Amino acid sequence: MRKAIIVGVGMTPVGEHWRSSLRDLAVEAILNAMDDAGIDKVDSLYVGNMAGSFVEQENLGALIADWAGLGNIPAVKIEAACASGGAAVQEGAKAVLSGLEDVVLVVGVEKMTDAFHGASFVALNALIMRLYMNTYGYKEEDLALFAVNAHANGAKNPYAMFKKPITVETVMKSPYIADPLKLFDASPVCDGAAAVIITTPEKAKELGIPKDKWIEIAGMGRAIDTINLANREDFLTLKAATIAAERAYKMAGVKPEDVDFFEVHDAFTVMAALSLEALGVAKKGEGAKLAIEGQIAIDGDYPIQTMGGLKARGHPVGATGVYQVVEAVLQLRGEAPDGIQVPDAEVGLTQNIGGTGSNITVTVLRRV
């Protein structure tokens, strides 16, 4: 009958950090998260990374524990493809919820500016894009609003990689990657590191962290779907998203109408729309309609991409899931950058998609 609360969050700017190492980014996020809680030591470490790889950087937990000076603590790496970050937080909370560890650190870190499966993935998302518009009567210009929303909300975010707003012709005149899909329909590949500190409220009071910093892990859901795309029920439905979302909603006792913002996997514009359809917010075929009707703005009914999303804050795969959770915490605490603060945030949601829908994580955070 325990409860799980995040008491510290920290992150690095997302960008092309050519001169930085995986270490510098990781330890930065960790230290900046252990001070947000005022903490000196953690009990265990969970790591998210979907490869930066010296291969010697495949024993990542022990490296990071050494680099951040945590001690001879337990540490492991969680990986669910591009949802590892999203999953590591979940595994981290289970540790505290188990009763075996009282302060748990979760760090996501990715350096893809190193210093076949991207092309195929792009072409697949693009066939999905043609399917979505042709089926539901949408146009490219409609889905472009998802990029405009992200670039707006990232323009007010010091940590984003893309900090200037844009117009729909900015995307409609970007180079095609696919014939539906363009440069600005697609999130950037980049570096970054984010970190979260999870505890139980008893140890939290024992350590003197004010209840003003506590954000509760209220709902957790994670599900797989088939890797074989010829055995999927529908291409315009992400089934793992729905299953995980249902589990997390039931666990937290909320409904989609109760939650005030959604950090979704807007790795491509089609995925933001499909994510909203699958998370319960919109009906099948009406995911992009919210974008046309503007309801995805900060002040809107269904704010998404609240600090830039994946398209503007950036997609450092495997820290993305941790970034989605730190920003949600910062939106639930009131400590959100000026210009992007969801008005009166009590419940927030986060969604990390790995593979083609093969492993999806949903988490529901509540204020306490």
Helix (H) or strand (E) holding 75: strand 75-78
C-alpha to C-alpha distance for 129 and 30, rounded to whole angstroms: 38
**Closest of 226, 216, 196, 186 to residue 309, by C-alpha:** 186
C-alpha to C-alpha distance for 324 and 96, rounded to whole angstroms: 20
Query: How far out from the chain centre does Cα 148 lie?
Result: 19
Query: How far out from the chain centre does Cα 287 lie?
Result: 19
CA dihedral in degrees (195, 29, 321, 216; nearest 10)? 30
Question: Cα angle vertex 199, ends 195, 201, to 5°?
Answer: 140
C-alpha to C-alpha distance for 119 and 124, rounded to whole angstroms: 9
- DSSP-derived letter for residue 57 is G
Token pair recorded at residue 57: 């950087």
Question: Cα angle vertex 286, ends 285, 290, to 5°?
Answer: 155
Answer yes or no: are the C-beta atoms of 190 and 316 closer than 8 Å: yes
Parallel, antiparallel or unpaired: strands 261-263 and 215-224? unpaired
C-alpha to C-alpha distance for 96 and 2, rounded to whole angstroms: 9
**What SS3 state is found at 323?**
helix
- Identify any residues that bridge with 221 across adjacent strands, giving them in sequence order: 362
- DSSP-derived letter for residue 91 is H
User: Please, where are the H alpha helices in the chain?
Assistant: 22-36, 60-67, 84-98, 119-136, 140-155, 168-172, 201-206, 239-252, 269-278, 287-292, 320-332
DSSP line for 185-223 = GBPPB-BEEEEEEEE-HHHHHHTT--TTS-EEEEEEEEE
3-state helix, strand, coil in the chain (%, to 5): 40, 20, 40
Q: How was this structure determined?
A: X-ray
Is 1 exposed, middle or buried (CB count within 10 Å of its CB: 0-12, 13-18, 19+)?
exposed
- The domains of the chain are located at 1-368
**Which residues have a catalytic role annotated?**
82, 315
Question: Resolution in angstroms, to 1 decimal, for this deposition?
Answer: 2.7
